[PDB]
């Protein structure tokens, strides 16, 4: 079904800027959509989505249409619109009621879970593997329940800040470190995370070295941390486990507007760090892979976004197909 190379964009449900693109126009480059976002209204539980495209039969039908080449749809929970708060079991229910209803309907392949607020850590809450905080025993809960009630074939993804995965390992805490607590407790379910990495400023590798974004280096250094596992919280008894390699993926603007922040990196630069990453070819960087091999099983990049490339003369989908497709 799913390549072990992949390109994942996310597809706007909403014109930004740079405008609309109708699903079957989209470049076949990429092998999965993410169609964002579904958002919430004031209960913040209960997700809503309306195509922002044709009617509801329409884009059902486009979905089928991309599902028919080989492509997977999945529907992007979050933005900022798309705040979700599950503080206690009504809500949990509301939250995986809608978002079942959603899959139906339109015939999604699985979610992605793209939420960067309304995520914090209690005092309290220190362990990744027993978390206690609602919100994120909650949706750890939820999305084990949507995941259970679709085949094998349900995709589940995520796209948290670096804040939340990464940071783990300056605290634990608040946003610190976050969604590790997610990713360990969905992890038999997960089929790929994408963390961000941009709009990010600077980052800690394993190290305890700062890389800043947008930097061979840093794209290494960050996905390291989940392709080998990290001490969280300066604790060197509190291991974060590695992912599978085809657990890791690289999210990435697609042009530099995408990242009005910073993070955006040259593909020639990129295709350094992807060298590294899964070959283990260096470049002459300062940052030292825990792999000296390399991990070739590394599942892809995603970007923000299938919009934004677009609009950048296709420089991520093509440059990237190229490079995965010549491994
Ligand atoms: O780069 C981004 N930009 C914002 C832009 C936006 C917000 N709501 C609608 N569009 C976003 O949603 N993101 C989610 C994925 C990356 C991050």
Do not use: C
């Not at 405008?19 to 999965?32: C, F, H």
């Not at 094998?152 to 590790?180: H, N, R």
């Not at 350094?272 to 892809?300: D, E, H, M, T, W």
């Amino acid at each position: 079904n799913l390549g072990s190379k992949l390109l994942v964009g996310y597809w706007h449900n909403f014109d930004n800027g740079t405008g609309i693109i109708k699903l079957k126009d989209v470049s076949p480059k990429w092998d999965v959509i993410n169609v964002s976002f579904g958002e919430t209204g004031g209960d913040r539980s209960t997700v809503e989505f309306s195509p922002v495209y044709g009617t509801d039969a329409d884009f059902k039908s486009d979905i089928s249409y991309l599902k028919s080449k080989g492509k997977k749809v999945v529907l992007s929970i979050g933005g900022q619109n798309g705040v979700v708060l599950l503080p206690d079991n009504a809500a949990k229910d509301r939250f995986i009621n809608s978002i079942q209803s959603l899959i139906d309907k339109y015939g999604f392949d699985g979610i992605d879970i793209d939420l960067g607020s309304g995520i914090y850590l209690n005092g309290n809450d220190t362990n990744f593997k027993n978390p206690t905080t609602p919100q994120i025993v909650n949706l750890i809960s939820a999305i084990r329940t949507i995941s259970d009630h679709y085949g094998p074939d349900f995709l589940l993804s995520m796209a948290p800040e670096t804040a939340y995965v990464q940071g783990g390992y300056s605290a634990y805490g608040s946003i610190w470190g976050a969604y590790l607590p997610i990713i360990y407790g969905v992890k038999d379910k997960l089929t790929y995370i994408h963390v961000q990495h941009f709009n990010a400023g600077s980052g800690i590798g394993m190290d305890g070295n700062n890389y800043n974004q947008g930097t061979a280096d840093y794209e290494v250094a960050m996905a390291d941390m989940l392709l080998h596992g990290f001490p969280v919280g300066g604790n060197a008894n509190n291991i974060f486990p590695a992912l599978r390699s085809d657990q890791v993926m690289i999210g990435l603007p697609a042009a530099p507007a995408a990242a009005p922040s910073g993070g955006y990196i040259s593909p020639t630069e990129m295709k350094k760090a992807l060298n590294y990453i899964i070959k283990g070819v260096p470049f002459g960087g300062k940052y030292k892979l825990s792999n000296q091999s390399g991990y070739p099983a590394f599942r892809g990049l995603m970007s923000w976004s299938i919009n934004w490339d677009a609009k950048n003369n296709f420089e991520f989908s093509n440059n990237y197909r190229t490079y995965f497709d010549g491994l």
